[PDB]
């Protein structure tokens with residue numbers, strides 16, 4: 001069910017690292033990537049997208065945004081999914 | 089401007105949810121929920137809370153994410169356009 005190339009925005013990797021990681025995928029032909037952010041990292045996921053958008057401009061498109069609530073530890077935590085497509 | 093809710097750092101999630109319901113009860117069809125920086129997470133928290141309370145009674149039209157300039161610095165924002173559904 002949870003296929004594709006999803007990248008979970010980590011609290012331990014900085015924003016620029018995530019941005020560079022996504023472009024590494026884009027460059028090898030993996031044109032669609034999913035950024036996932038849960039809890040406080042939801043803000044970070046948007047930060048990653050913005051940084052990606054600043055350096056790729058018209059070259060990347062935010063296909064859609066999906067927000068929800070999951071399980072995780074013990075209580076319902078919020079999450080966001082930013083689906084990105086590299087465009088030429 | 090009058091139907092937009094800026095998520096604040098010093099107010100809890102539930103407080104913002106109530107601010108929306110108050111507008112909905114006031115007969116307002118749509119409300120804009122905005123969060124910038126660290127509060128982007130909270131804005132989504134407010135939505136999931138609103139949905140948990142009103143459920144089918146509320147609908148998210150669209151989500152706008154991007155960056156704006158505040159104090160000569162770039163900051164991220166998220167916008168959740170909500171429809172009352174009455």
Ligand SMILES: [Zn+2]
Nearest residue numbers: 013017018021
């Ligand atoms: Zn990395």
